[PDB]
Amino acid sequence: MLQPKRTKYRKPHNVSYEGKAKGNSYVAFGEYGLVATKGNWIDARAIESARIAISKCLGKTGKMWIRIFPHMSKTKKPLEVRMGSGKGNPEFWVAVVKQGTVMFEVANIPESQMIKALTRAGHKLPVTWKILKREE
Amino acid sequence: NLKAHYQKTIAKELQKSFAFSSIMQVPRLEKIVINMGVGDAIRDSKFLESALNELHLISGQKPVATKAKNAISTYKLRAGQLIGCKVTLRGERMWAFLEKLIYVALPRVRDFRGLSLKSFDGRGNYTIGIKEQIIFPEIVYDDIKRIRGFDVTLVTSTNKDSEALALLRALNLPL
Amino acid sequence: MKTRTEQRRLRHKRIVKKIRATNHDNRVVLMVIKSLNHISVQAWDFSQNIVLASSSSLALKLKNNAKLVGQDIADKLVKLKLTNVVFDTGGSKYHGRIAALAEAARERGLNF
Amino acid sequence: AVKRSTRLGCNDCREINYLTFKNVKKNPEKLALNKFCSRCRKVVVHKEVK
Amino acid sequence: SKKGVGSTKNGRDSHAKRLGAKKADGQMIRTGQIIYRQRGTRVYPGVNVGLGSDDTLFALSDGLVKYQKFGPKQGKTRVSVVKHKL
Amino acid sequence: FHFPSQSVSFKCASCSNSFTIESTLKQKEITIDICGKCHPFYIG
RNA sequence: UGGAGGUAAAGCUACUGAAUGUAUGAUGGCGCCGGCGUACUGAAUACAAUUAAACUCUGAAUGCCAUUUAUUUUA
RNA sequence: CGGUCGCCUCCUAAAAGGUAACGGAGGCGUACAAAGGUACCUUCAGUACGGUUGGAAAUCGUAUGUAGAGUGUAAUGGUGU
RNA sequence: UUUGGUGCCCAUGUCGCUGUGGAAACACCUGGUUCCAUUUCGAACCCAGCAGUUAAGCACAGUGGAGCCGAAUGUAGCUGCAGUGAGAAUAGGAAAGCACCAAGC
């Protein structure tokens, strides 16, 4: 999949993030971005699924970047186990998403193909796809 | 004595040849450092007596060793572990040893084809490094068991390497 | 770089500040400059950033050995009654005619 | 539980005078400091009396 | 059903000696009163402030507590018992 | 203080370099064959 | 009103750490002949934007203690 | 029972601080007769240059950066004569 | 006030450069010539003087450049749902300023 080198803490809290979009409200080097209508904790499986679906339905001469890479860790507990004993277990690393952050920034391929690519990634991504233009 | 002779005629000649806004931007010398880096003294070469003794022999100031800059495992030393010996040279002793350095040590340099190796740091210093500790008749090759010399250094208050080069050119030192 | 003067100044300032801090009741400040020709002394009161009196070849007691270079300023300060001063040891270390000058304060009222 | 302080007594009256921390590693020996004693009211060289 | 459950880490909040602004601006403070409690010299005593053998700041003499920013960035904080009459 | 170092003179054989100066206290007049103009490139 | 926070928040080339094209691109993959740029490892900055309770260059309101006019009650 | 029984470093814990948790981050059960005091002196580590071994670091002489060195600690901040 | 002492606010004022005044004072310099000191000695430290100097030590104008600070609105925060108002960005700023003593006055 897509994996970070390390996380800041092995078992970070699922802490609430009330506020607004910090950092990425746009793309950094692409021409469009798959921007979500929500901010949550997402894993690398959907990241890879959406990214490779986008690349498959795009062309070649365009360039690809992932902006908000997975940076923190996810702590999830198995099921059918009684509540207690603190937190769960460290698992798949997580990319923190805020209200307006962009996962994938792409460039140099026909534009409507970019819109379609982000839509079909929204099919492969838990969030409702949102289209974003070129910014920096 | 080279001291008064230089300070009277040669310093003035250097000042008037390439002039400044005064006659104290002349090539200035704060001191003369004589050095014997012996780090294998801890590794049992001669247990630090060689550097102290021979520098004291070629000293004008009481020899004080300096603590190491770092702590390294390939040459054991930590929290001090003074390696080698170091002597500063002030007052009379500066020119007292410059006379022997320029008149006696210079022709005895094995690689003496013009000492302009550009050992300047561009920071107003000139770092003469010789792998032959036998450069003065003030030392006999029986103190240490290694190829050894000195990293002596001419120093300047106002940092200008050309000033040290001018000092070198005017003291019978071929370039 | 250094011209053997700003080291004296930096030592002198650090020590006068530390000694002023030793006594919470700040007195008149005796800062003395060991110049190469003579020795100058100034009564900096560290409450207004001003000077009360001075003694040097221009102020009083022409070039310093001459223990009166400190005696006159101490006499001026006992006309001000700020004795037991926060006496700076000086960046120039306490030797030479300064040994005459510094104790010249003690013999002339400054009971530090 | 265990103690790093030391119990020190005056060498002129044998009373127990001082209880202060005491380096036990690099100074395992009994401490002999010249500090104030009360039954004579003056600085005397106390010794470990126990 | 319970026959054993996962352990608990040494991860509960560490409580220190009670510290904070024991005195505030505008009120007279008296000598010996604990004006500030710190663990390590970070907030610096000014004038007429005593530091005991706990890094505990009390009033050497009477005055008013004052917290001032100074230095090259207004980041350094000095606590000082400025000489206000008792 | 460094143990006292006294005046030493010099004498050469192929250059006759005579110079007196304060230096190491094991020698009074250093007589040598190579000093001054004796090295092949000491000239200049 | 005073004090300072460091919560929220922008930002993290302002740091702690992951991160990306772009800049030198050493340096080692890879060959080359002490010589050489590298299919890639590729430092950190210039530049580019990031992620974050245990990150804070900054950075509030609120809150907090003191402050003075002040009101309740015989507590 | 797992785990626990004394104490401290960060935060969730909502800005003085605090802040609950079967909440996630580390340990301690001490260390200096100097690491106390007085006084005087005294600094960055690093990095760089050029240099007897000495190589990247020792080594000298500097420049350099001005706190990322150090300061007893676990972590925190703090500390520029 | 020219110029010597340095407090005091900070990166605007931190740095860099163009330079300027030094005539007395000042700094280097003359030397280790004693007092004094070097964790090592004339490098300080001490002496007792300035042949010399504006370069540096000192001070004085500019260099808005590196760099600082970063305005208003808005923006999150905030939390009667708008203000409240960050940050951050821009404008612009600043090349220091705040004084005494002392001689050149």
UniProtKB/Swiss-Prot annotation, chain A:
Q: Does the keyword DNA damage apply?
A: no
Q: Name one GO cellular component term.
A: cytosolic large ribosomal subunit
InterPro entries from the UniProt entry: Ribosomal_uL16 (IPR047873), Ribosomal_uL16_bact-type (IPR000114), Ribosomal_uL16_CS (IPR020798), Ribosomal_uL16_dom (IPR016180), Ribosomal_uL16_sf (IPR036920)
Keyword entries, A-Z: Ribonucleoprotein, Ribosomal protein, RNA-binding, rRNA-binding, tRNA-binding
One molecular function GO term is:
rRNA binding
* Entry-linked Pfam families: Ribosomal_L16
Sorted alphabetically, the Gene Ontology BP terms of this entry are:
translation
Look up the domain of life of the source: Bacteria
- Function summary: Binds 23S rRNA and is also seen to make contacts with the A and possibly P site tRNAs.
- How does the record describe its quaternary structure? Part of the 50S ribosomal subunit.
Q: Which family does it belong to?
A: Belongs to the universal ribosomal protein uL16 family.
- The protein here is known as Large ribosomal subunit protein uL16
According to the entry, what is the taxonomic lineage of the organism? Bacteria, Bacillati, Mycoplasmatota, Mycoplasmoidales, Mycoplasmoidaceae
From Swiss-Prot, chain B:
Give the protein family: Belongs to the universal ribosomal protein uL5 family.
Q: Give the record's GO biological process terms.
A: translation
Q: Which domain of life is it from?
A: Bacteria
* Molecular-function GO terms, alphabetical: rRNA binding; structural constituent of ribosome; tRNA binding
- Known function: This is one of the proteins that bind and probably mediate the attachment of the 5S RNA into the large ribosomal subunit, where it forms part of the central protuberance. In the 70S ribosome it contacts protein S13 of the 30S subunit (bridge B1b), connecting the 2 subunits; this bridge is implicated in subunit movement. Contacts the P site tRNA; the 5S rRNA and some of its associated proteins might help stabilize positioning of ribosome-bound tRNAs.
Checking Pfam families in the record gives:
Ribosomal_L5, Ribosomal_L5_C
PANTHER family listed in its UniProt record: 60S RIBOSOMAL PROTEIN L11-RELATED (PTHR11994)
Provide GO CC annotations from the record: ribonucleoprotein complex; ribosome
SUPFAM superfamilies from the UniProt entry: RL5-like (SSF55282)
Quaternary context: Part of the 50S ribosomal subunit; part of the 5S rRNA/L5/L18/L25 subcomplex. Contacts the 5S rRNA and the P site tRNA. Forms a bridge to the 30S subunit in the 70S ribosome.
HAMAP family associated with the record: Ribosomal_uL5_B (MF_01333_B)
Q: What is this protein called?
A: Large ribosomal subunit protein uL5
Keywords on record = Ribonucleoprotein, Ribosomal protein, RNA-binding, rRNA-binding, tRNA-binding
Keyword tRNA-binding in annotation: yes
NCBIfam families listed in its UniProt record: PRK00010.1
Q: What InterPro entries does the entry give?
A: Ribosomal_uL5 (IPR002132), Ribosomal_uL5_bac-type (IPR020930), Ribosomal_uL5_C (IPR031309), Ribosomal_uL5_CS (IPR020929), Ribosomal_uL5_dom_sf (IPR022803), Ribosomal_uL5_N (IPR031310)
Swiss-Prot record, chain E:
- Name of the molecule in the record: Large ribosomal subunit protein bL27
Its organism's taxonomic lineage begins at:
Bacteria, Bacillati, Mycoplasmatota, Mycoplasmoidales, Mycoplasmoidaceae
Q: Give the organism, scientific name.
A: Mycoplasma pneumoniae (strain ATCC 29342 / M129 / Subtype 1)
> What protein family is recorded?
Belongs to the bacterial ribosomal protein bL27 family.
* Origin superkingdom: Bacteria
Q: Which processes are annotated in GO (biological process)?
A: translation
Span covered, complete protein: 17 to 102 of 104
Q: How is it modified after translation?
A: The N-terminus is cleaved by ribosomal processing cysteine protease Prp.
What GO annotations for molecular function exist for this entry?
structural constituent of ribosome
Gene Ontology cellular component terms for the protein in this record: cytosolic large ribosomal subunit
Q: Which UniProt keywords apply?
A: Ribonucleoprotein, Ribosomal protein
Curated annotation (Swiss-Prot), chain F:
This chain's function reads: Binds the 23S rRNA.
How is the quaternary structure described? Answer: Part of the 50S ribosomal subunit.
Q: Which family does it belong to?
A: Belongs to the bacterial ribosomal protein bL31 family. Type A subfamily.
Q: What is this protein called?
A: Large ribosomal subunit protein bL31
To which species is this protein native? Mycoplasma pneumoniae (strain ATCC 29342 / M129 / Subtype 1)
| Organism lineage string | Bacteria, Bacillati, Mycoplasmatota, Mycoplasmoidales, Mycoplasmoidaceae
Portion of the parent chain present: 5 to 48 of 97
